[PDB]
Each structure stands twice: as structure tokens, then as C-alpha cells.
């Protein structure tokens, strides 16, 4: 956990060396309290005004009134009314990555996703062990920003547990307010979200490597590079 | 087989309870004869003016003049010249689904496909056993409208056979004129089209669940949620 | 290796019979020297001005300064400044295919990709054995144009080796200047690029079959045939 808006020093003296050594980097106090609170207010307002999905279907029985649903999501561009501070976070994330370019592995980052805002509703659901990009879709770095004030995992659960490749250990990350996490999106970092027993919010952006994305366009072929005659 | 343009009673008293109990619902006389005949005329005109593909490649030998092809398709938005009544069918299907919303399982339907018009040419080809959505691409309900007047499966074949999960039985559906079929698109309903020995037309729309579709955008990643820096 | 801008005779007397018999067709002197040299100049200028990716990641060790990268690519529409002659090549390829239509197997070609320009940097990397379209994504014909003057595979490597299905033999194709290659994109033609020890350029376009592409839209579902309610 390194310590932070100014961040070139953070990128060059902490994020780049940490990513190249461990593949997992945690920055605490990324935006500061005023800004982090504004983002949390925007995300709660999206939740309270019904902009999230109903949640991943976790258990489906004969009676659909008992169906259990987990993580809820919404995709945010950063330009929508009421999402301007999420947009500021995304710009901040983008400036950090730009300052790392050419220094994160041998990747050359040239694109990203929209922001994926996730809400674990606090009903004991988590997210199963997975790899974000197991099949070469172009995503090289996962970046998550957490929004949960005074989170106490001893009673609320919700820890991100990463299983770094080749090492016999876990890396456990609490989803703390104003924490920014980076990790390699491929099979080097399988991970899971342990059951959350309180409402838990996070915002994820994935960053794309230019070479991997260019050749993915053949595999994930759409109309895309398909055109008329 | 329930019985039908007015249809809120049909949705609430038949379609919703049948889908939640059996996963497979058949509505006969959905649009009535005048309208059903107009749709059939539009589809035959698309066929006769060459708008369908040449058909699924079924057998490919050394000599391509003998290649066997099966089902032919065309994708219809519903706004094209000469497709206005298909467009009316799609609007009718959409109004029905809207009246079911929140009541079909725990799904929240927020999108659909264009209409897939299919023609089995009558040369003994059918469609192999499959699941429509086996990998979580967002499609929750399959809706098929049939256009075949006086169909007699005893001589023309072409029955849809569904293999509902967990039950040791078949559900056999004849592709009858003005019949509308609903079934869950996932692995609950593997199905096949038995060999058709007469020209057989159907129109399919798939309906998307909001949560499943939102998270599919990560799996089926395109430029999509991918954007520039 | 048949012999060539005029080419209807080439399509009808050589390409069509060769593709239907062998699945692999080589045309030498396709555009002639003046035009081929102009294309090579355009491709080298894209390389020299940094328009290619950094190359397929081949070896990734703990230290990313030693990472080995292979083939570099760029996607070209044919209308960009400085790509007009690539655009002429693409138009030439498209006119040839149009003159074959209905005669290549039972396919009906109705679309293509943008041009994929590839550069093997000459560092001993090649491309592993693969099939271009193994899963039914609509691509029926692969068309490659080579740009390498006085290529000598005895010292530079870089041969395309195809492993035609059912036959116990290789088909070895040198990546010669102004050579145009056609082959079926599916599992009939697994192939590899043997290690290249000099800079090696090629331009690939894939051609889509109408039926296979229409039904791929269901499998590779995007927002695509997905639309709002
Ligand atoms: O929230 C966290 O600490 C870690 N979360 C994830 O790893 C995560 N990963 C994916 Cl791929 C999805 C994908 C969809 C919805 C939520 C996700 C999620 O929370
Ligand atoms: O027509 C029928 O009763 C049932 N047909 C299908 O189940 C069906 N399913 C798919 Cl996924 C396709 C897909 C492509 C073309 C035709 C299809 C078809 O008829
Ligand atoms: O260059 C050649 O002779 C043959 N090359 C290929 O077969 C080839 N195939 C694919 Cl699918 C890719 C795909 C991405 C980049 C380069 C490729 C390549 O050179
Ligand atoms: Mn993840
Ligand atoms: Mn089906
Ligand atoms: Mn290839």
C-alpha cells in the first residue's frame, strides 16, 4: 500500500516497480476524502435511482421469488449527468496509466473500457474464483477503485483474495475507501471476492494492450473489421 | 396451447403461469388469419426475390455442385419496404413481453434481437439438437412465430422437439400457421427441428435479460465497452 | 503458380479450378513490378513511422526488457493517406473474388475484412500451426499478398507451410514479391509460418460467406443484431 491528484511520482516510484515485481499494486488515499466522498455519493445515487442491474443470478430454483442474486452492475461512460466525478476518477486513472506507458511489462496501452460500477448487495454473495482475461481479449491491466468507508472485513467480509501464480500464498485486499488497486488481468492473477455481508461498492476499468487487442479483432470477429464488398 | 391483437389477459393468465411452471408456452391464433396471411405473403416475397441466404451447409463433398444445404435465413429489422407486417408482429411480440416484465422468472427483459426469418427448404434437412444460449450471452426467452398453413407433420415432418431438462419426455410442437411459441433459451430447453419435407417458415426473436447482458459485455468484448484513451 | 491488372481469365481458367481441386492457389506477378514496389514502399513507410504494433508476445519472462515479440500488425482500410496503393490492391482482390462468385465451392461471398498488414521482424519468430477459422465465424477464403523482393528462404526462412487435410504432404509457399495466395480458411488448411530471419511483409484479407456469416451473428452476439425494446 503506497500513498497518494498529483501522481507522476507515484507512477514512477511505486506503481511501475511494484507491478513489474509483484503484479499487484495497492495505492491508498488516491483521490482524498472530499473527492472520494463525492464519488461515493454519485454511486449511491445511481443505486438508489435504479440504474444498476438486479444482480448476478446465483441460485435459480423452481420458484423464482426465492432466486438469489449477487453483484449488481452498471456501465458508466463518465459524461452522464450525475456521473461527473466518476468521470474525474476515470481521467485520473487514465493520466496515471499514460505516465506508466512503456514501463508496465512490455505492454503498450492504447484503450480502456467504460467504467464498470459494481455493488455487492450485502446478502452473503461474493464472486467465484476467476481470471479476468483468460483467452487473450486484449485486457492487460485491471484497475479497481473502492468506495467503502470504515469497512471492517471482520464483520462485513468482502475481501478480494488474489492467488498469484507460482507462489503458495494469498494476497488479501480489503475494499477500503479511496483505495486504488492494479493487477495484471491475465492468468497470473486468479482472484475471488469473498462473501460480502454489507453493501460493497467498487469501480473497475480495464486497460487494453495494443498488440493483443489488434490480433483479438480476428478471434472476436464482429461487424469490427468485417466490411462490405 | 392457449388461444388468442389484445393480449394482456393472455400474458397474465396464460403465458406467465405456463412459463414459470413448464418453461415452454404455445399460443395458437396469435394474430388472426388476415394478418397472419399478410406476414406469410411478406416472407414468401423475401424468399422469391432472393433475400434469404443459400442455407446452412449440411454436407460438403469433393464436388460442390452436390453440396447439401439446409435452413436459409434473413435478418429483418421490421422497418424495411415490404416488411411492415413483420414489423407489426415484432411490435406485438414486444408488447406481450412488456406486459410480462418482472413476472418471467426473475428476469428483467431490456432488449431483443432483430427478427430471424428461417426457411427450411423441404429437402429433408432439419436442425440438430442444440441449446440456443448455452454460454450466457444474455438471451433468456426464445419467441418463434410460425407461418405454415395446413401443415401436416405426418407427411411434411418439421416438428420442433424440445427435451425439457430433468423430465423423461419430449415436447413436440408442430410449426402451425399463426402459432406463437415461447421457451427459455438456456440449457433448460435443448431442442431440434426434425427433418422437413416441405417448405417451412418461421420467425424468431430472442429477448435479453438486463443483468446477464450487462455482464456478457465483459466476456463478448468488442469495440462494445472498449474505448479510446 | 499461375501467372498474371486484367484477371477474369485468371479467375475463370486458373483460380476457380485450382481452388475447387486443391483448396490452395498461388498467382505470381499479380500486380506487376511498378505497382508491387509502390505497395512495398507504402508498407515500409507504415513500419518506419510506427503504425504497426510491437509484435505478438512470444516469450514473457520475469524481466520484461527481455520479452520476445514476433509478428507485428496494422489494420488498413485502404482509404488512409499513404495507403492508396494498398487500397488499389484490395480493389484488385475484390474484383477477382467477384468474378469467382458462385464458383468457389458453394459459397456466396458478400463481405471481407479490412486488410491485415503483417511484419515478421526477422528475429527468428514465426507463427504456430493454426486454422484461420476453426469455429464458423464466416470466413471462407484467406487471400495473402506478399511483398518481399528477392526472398531466399534458404537463408531467410519464413516459408508458409500448409498441411492440407487428408493428404500426407506439405505445401510450402515462399513469401515472394508480388505473389497472391488463396486458400480455404477452415480446417481443411492448417498452416504455420516457419521462423523468419529477415523482415517479412504480407497483406491478408479474409472473405466472408453469406450464409455462414448470417448465422454466426447468433453465436458471436454483439450490440450486432441486439437492439433496444
Ligand atoms: O470487486 C472486487 O474486489 C473484485 N471484483 C472482480 O474481480 C470482479 N470481476 C469481474 Cl470479471 C466481474 C464481472 C462482472 C461483475 C462484477 C465483477 C467483479 O466484481
Ligand atoms: O424453427 C423451429 O421450430 C426451431 N428452430 C430453431 O430452434 C433454430 N435455432 C437456431 Cl439457434 C437457428 C439458428 C440459425 C438458423 C436457424 C435456427 C433455427 O431454426
Ligand atoms: O504470412 C503468412 O504466410 C501466413 N500467415 C498467417 O497464416 C497468419 N495467420 C494469422 Cl490467423 C495471423 C493473425 C495475426 C497476425 C498474423 C497472422 C498471420 O501471419
Ligand atoms: Mn475480476
Ligand atoms: Mn434453436
Ligand atoms: Mn493464418
Amino acid at each position: 500500500n503506497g500513498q497518494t491528484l498529483p501522481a507522476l511520482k507515484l507512477a514512477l516510484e511505486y506503481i511501475v516497480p511494484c507491478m513489474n515485481k509483484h503484479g499487484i499494486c495497492v495505492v491508498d488515499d488516491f483521490l482524498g476524502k472530499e473527492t472520494g466522498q463525492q464519488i461515493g455519493d454519485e454511486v449511491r445515487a445511481l443505486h438508489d435511482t435504479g440504474k444498476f442491474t438486479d444482480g448476478q443470478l446465483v441460485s435459480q430454483k423452481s420458484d423464482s421469488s426465492k432466486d438469489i442474486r449477487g453483484d449488481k452492475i452498471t456501465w458508466i461512460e463518465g459524461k452522464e449527468p450525475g456521473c461527473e466525478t466518476i468521470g474525474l476518477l476515470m481521467s485520473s486513472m487514465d493520466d496515471l496509466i499514460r505516465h506508466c506507458n512503456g514501463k508496465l511489462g512490455s505492454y503498450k496501452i492504447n484503450g480502456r473500457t467504460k467504467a464498470m460500477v459494481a455493488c455487492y448487495p450485502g446478502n452473503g454473495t461474493g464472486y467465484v474464483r476467476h481470471v479476468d482475461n483468460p483467452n487473450g481479449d486484449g485486457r492487460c491491466v485491471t484497475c479497481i477503485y473502492y468506495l467503502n468507508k470504515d469497512w471492517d472485513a471482520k464483520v462485513s467480509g468482502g475481501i478480494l483474495r488474489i492467488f498469484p501464480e507460482g507462489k503458495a500464498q494469498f494476497a488479501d485486499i480489503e475494499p477500503k475507501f479511496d483505495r486504488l488497486l492494479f493487477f495484471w488481468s491475465d492468468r497470473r492473477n486468479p482472484h475471488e471476492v469473498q462473501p460480502a455481508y454489507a453493501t460493497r461498492y467498487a469501480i473497475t476499468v480495464w486497460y487494453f494492450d495494443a498488440d493483443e487487442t489488434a490480433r483479438a479483432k480476428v478471434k472476436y470477429l464482429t461487424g469490427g473489421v468485417r466490411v462490405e464488398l
Side-chain angles (χ1 to χ4, degrees), chain A residues 78-97:
Chain A
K79 300 174 174 174
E80 303 91 335
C83 297
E84 292 150 42
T85 315
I86 297 165
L88 210 181
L89 163 69
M90 292 160 79
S91 291
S92 302
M93 291 177 168
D94 288 353
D95 292 3
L96 200 167
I97 291 297

Side-chain angles (χ1 to χ4, degrees), chain A residues 56 71 73 75 116-120 126-128 130-133 139 142 144-146 158-161 173-175 181 183 191-194 200-204 206:
Chain A
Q56 193 173 179
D71 59 279
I73 58 171
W75 288 103
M116 187 187 77
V117 188
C119 172
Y120 293 71
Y127 200 99
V128 297
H130 66 290
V131 166
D132 279 356
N133 172 25
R139 292 180 292 160
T142 304
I144 311 185
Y145 179 77
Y146 297 100
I159 289 167
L160 168 62
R161 172 165 290 178
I173 302 160
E174 290 188 60
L181 168 70
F183 60 89
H191 53 287
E192 68 187 20
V193 173
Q194 295 194 329
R200 176 199 193 271
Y201 295 103
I203 304 172
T204 302
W206 287 275

Side-chain angles (χ1 to χ4, degrees), chain A residues 100 119 129 211 213:
Chain A
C100 296
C119 172
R129 178 175 169 148
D211 184 89
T213 301

Side-chain angles (χ1 to χ4, degrees), chain A residues 14 16 18 23 25-26 45 77 81 83 85 88 90 103 113 138-139 146 163-164 169 187 212-213:
Chain A
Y14 179 53
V16 162
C18 171
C25 183
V26 177
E77 176 183 28
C83 297
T85 315
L88 210 181
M90 292 160 79
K103 305 180 199 65
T113 62
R139 292 180 292 160
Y146 297 100
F163 305 95
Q169 192 58 235
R187 69 202 167 275
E212 185 183 328
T213 301

Side-chain angles (χ1 to χ4, degrees), chain A residues 166 168-175 177-185:
Chain A
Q169 192 58 235
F170 311 142
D172 290 336
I173 302 160
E174 290 188 60
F177 174 80
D178 202 24
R179 165 174 285 193
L180 181 71
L181 168 70
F182 297 93
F183 60 89
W184 303 129
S185 306

Side-chain angles (χ1 to χ4, degrees), chain A residues 19-32 35-50 52-60 63-64 67-71 73-79:
Chain A
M19 282 299 289
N20 288 317
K21 174 166 179 173
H22 301 118
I24 304 170
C25 183
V26 177
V27 173
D28 273 318
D29 302 318
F30 180 47
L31 298 180
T35 301
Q37 189 86 37
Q38 275 160 282
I39 293 163
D41 280 353
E42 293 184 344
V43 164
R44 287 188 287 281
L46 295 172
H47 180 260
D48 295 343
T49 60
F52 285 74
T53 67
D54 287 357
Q56 193 173 179
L57 192 63
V58 178
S59 278
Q60 194 177 55
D63 166 38
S64 309
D67 282 8
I68 301 302
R69 288 190 172 263
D71 59 279
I73 58 171
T74 187
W75 288 103
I76 296 301
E77 176 183 28
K79 300 174 174 174

